[PDB]
Amino acid sequence: ADKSDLGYTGLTDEQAQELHSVYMSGLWLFSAVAIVAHLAVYIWRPWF
Numbered sequence: 001a002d003k004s005d006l007g008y009t010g011l012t013d014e015q016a017q018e019l020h021s022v023y024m025s026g027l028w029l030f031s032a033v034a035i036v037a038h039l040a041v042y043i044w045r046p047w048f
Contacts, residue, residue, distance in 0.1 A: 022029065
């Protein structure tokens with residue numbers, strides 16, 4: 001009966017709070033994020 005699958009959609013509040021706390025908790029996390037994105041694109045160039 002109970003599926004409790006509604007938790008997948010209602011992850012917005014958790015998403016906001018999670019990103020906010022982690023962003024502050026790890027303000028320098030952006031640097032990692034930058035490397036991943038930059039490198040990712042470098043990987044996309046040869047993929048086209």
